Paper text:
To further explore the role of the residue at position +4, we determined the structure of WDR5 in complex with a Kif2A 114-122 peptide carrying an S121G mutation. Interestingly, Gly121 in Kif2A still forms a hydrogen bond with WDR5 Tyr191 via its backbone carbonyl but loses the hydrogen bond interaction with Lys259 observed in the WDR5-Kif2A_ 114–122 complex. Structural superposition of WDR5 in complex with Kif2A 114–122 and Kif2A 114–122_S121G revealed that the conformations of residues around the S7 site, including Phe133, Phe149, Pro173 and Tyr191, remained largely unchanged. Surface analysis revealed that the S7 site can be induced in Kif2A 114–122_S121G-bound WDR5. These results suggested that the carbonyl group of Gly121 induces Tyr191 rotation similar to that of the hydroxyl group of Ser121. However, the S121G mutation in Kif2A reduces its binding affinity for WDR5 by 3.8-fold, confirming that Ser121 at position +4 drives Tyr191 rotation more efficiently. Interestingly, we also demonstrated that the hydroxyl group of Ser121 in Kif2A is more efficient than the carbonyl group of Gly121 at promoting S7 pocket formation (Ser121 K D = 0.78 μM vs Gly121 K D = 3.72 μM).
WD repeat-containing protein 5 (WDR5), a core component of the mixed lineage leukemia (MLL) methyltransferase complex, directly binds to kinesin family member 2A (Kif2A) to regulate these mitotic events. In addition to transcriptional regulation, WDR5 also functions as a scaffold protein, facilitating the assembly of diverse protein complexes through its WD40 repeat domain, which forms a β-propeller structure. WDR5 has two distinct binding pockets: the WDR5-interacting (WIN) site and the WDR5-binding motif (WBM) site. Emerging evidence suggests that the non-canonical role of WDR5 in mitosis is mediated by its interaction with Kif2A, a kinesin-13 family member that specializes in microtubule depolymerization.
Residue numbers in the entry:
A (entry chain C): 114 to 121
B (entry chain A): 31 to 334
The structure:
C-alpha cells in the first residue's frame, strides 16, 4: 500500500 | 446561505485505497493516486476514465499538477517522486534522495520547483528540469505530512507529526516561522489560503485551525469531524460561498462556513475514511476519495 492510507 | 452539494458520479477502478485527488488547474481533469501504485486521470465534468499512469514500484501517497496542467508529480512508498508527462503517460524524471516513504508533494506556481515531504523527516526542494535535489531541509523530527507553496512561490509551509507547522523561505531554505499550539498534537495537514495570508492546519485532535502565520494567531477553528489517525486533505472552497472542505474518519465530507465556523453540509456515501478532497478551480465541484474499504472517488456538484 501507501503510507497515507495507513493509520499513525 | 448553505451549499447543496449533490452526488454526480462515483469513479471506480482503483484496486486499493485511494490516497489523493487533485483537479488540473485548467479544470478539465481529475488526477487520483492510489495505494495500488497507479495514477488515474478522469474527466472532471463527466467522470469518464481517461487513462492509467504507472511505474512506481510501491503505493502512492500524493500527486500534484503543474500550473500549465501538463505535468504531474507523485510521491511514493518506493522513496521516490516521479515527474510525469500527462499526455504521453511517460515518466520524465525519478527524484531520488529521500530515505523513507515520500508522503506529500507540490509544484510551485512557476512550476520550475517541486517540494516533497517524507517519513525521513526532511523537506526536499527539487529542480523540475534536471530532477536534481536542490535543497534538503532538516525540517522536522517526525514524518512530514504536508508541503505547500504560497501564491508567489517564495514560501513553503510544512507540517509534521512532531506537532510543528513551519514556514520556510524557498530561495534561502531557512525557517521563517514555527507554529506550536496547545500540547503540540501531530499536525496531519497544512496548506496556504489562496491569497497566501493564512494557513489551514489539521491536527489529530479532531481539529482544523485557520492561522495568520506571520502574526502567529489562530483566527478560526473547525470541529465536529473525526480526524485522529490519518493525514486528511483540507481545502478552501472559493468558487461560490467561502467554505472549508475536509474529509473525515467517520466516512463523511464536512463543509464549514469559513467565517462562522458552523458546519453547513455533510456529504454521505463513502464507506471508509475520506482521505482526500479537492475543490474545482472554477465550478462548485468537490472531488472526494476514500481508503481500502471504499476505493472510489466521488464527484459532487453544488449551486453555490
Amino acid at each position: 500500500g501507501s503510507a497515507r492510507a495507513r493509520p499513525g | 446561505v448553505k451549499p447543496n452539494y449533490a452526488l454526480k458520479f462515483t469513479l471506480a477502478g482503483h484496486t486499493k485505497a485511494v490516497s489523493s485527488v487533485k483537479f488540473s488547474p485548467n479544470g478539465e481533469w481529475l488526477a487520483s493516486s492510489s495505494a495500488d501504485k497507479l495514477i488515474k486521470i478522469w474527466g472532471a465534468y463527466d467522470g469518464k476514465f481517461e487513462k492509467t499512469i504507472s511505474g512506481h514500484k510501491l503505493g502512492i501517497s500524493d500527486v500534484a499538477w503543474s500550473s500549465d496542467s501538463n505535468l504531474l508529480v507523485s510521491a511514493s512508498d518506493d522513496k521516490t517522486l516521479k515527474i510525469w508527462d500527462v499526455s504521453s503517460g511517460k515518466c520524465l524524471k525519478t527524484l531520488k534522495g529521500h530515505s523513507n516513504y515520500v508522503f506529500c508533494c507540490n509544484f510551485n506556481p512557476q512550476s520550475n520547483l517541486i517540494v516533497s515531504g517524507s517519513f525521513d523527516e526532511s523537506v526536499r526542494i527539487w529542480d523540475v528540469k534536471t530532477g536534481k535535489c536542490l535543497k534538503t531541509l532538516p525540517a522536522h523530527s517526525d514524518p512530514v505530512s504536508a508541503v505547500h507553496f504560497n501564491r508567489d512561490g517564495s514560501l513553503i509551509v510544512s507540517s509534521s507529526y512532531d506537532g510543528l507547522c513551519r514556514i520556510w523561505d524557498t530561495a534561502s531554505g531557512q525557517c521563517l516561522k514555527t507554529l506550536i499550539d496547545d500540547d503540540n498534537p501531530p499536525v496531519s495537514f497544512v496548506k496556504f489560503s489562496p491569497n497566501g495570508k493564512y494557513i489551514l492546519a489539521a491536527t489529530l485532535d479532531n481539529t482544523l485551525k485557520l492561522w495568520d502565520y506571520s502574526k502567529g494567531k489562530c483566527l478560526k477553528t473547525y470541529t465536529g469531524h473525526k480526524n485522529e489517525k490519518y493525514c486528511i486533505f483540507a481545502n478552501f472552497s472559493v468558487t461560490g460561498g467561502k467554505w472549508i472542505v475536509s474529509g473525515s474518519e467517520d466516512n463523511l465530507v464536512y463543509i464549514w462556513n469559513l467565517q462562522t465556523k458552523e458546519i453547513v453540509q455533510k456529504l454521505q456515501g463513502h464507506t471508509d475514511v475520506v482521505i482526500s478532497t479537492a475543490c474545482h478551480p472554477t465550478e462548485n465541484i468537490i472531488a472526494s476519495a476514500a481508503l481500502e474499504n471504499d476505493k472510489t472517488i466521488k464527484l459532487w456538484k453544488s449551486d453555490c
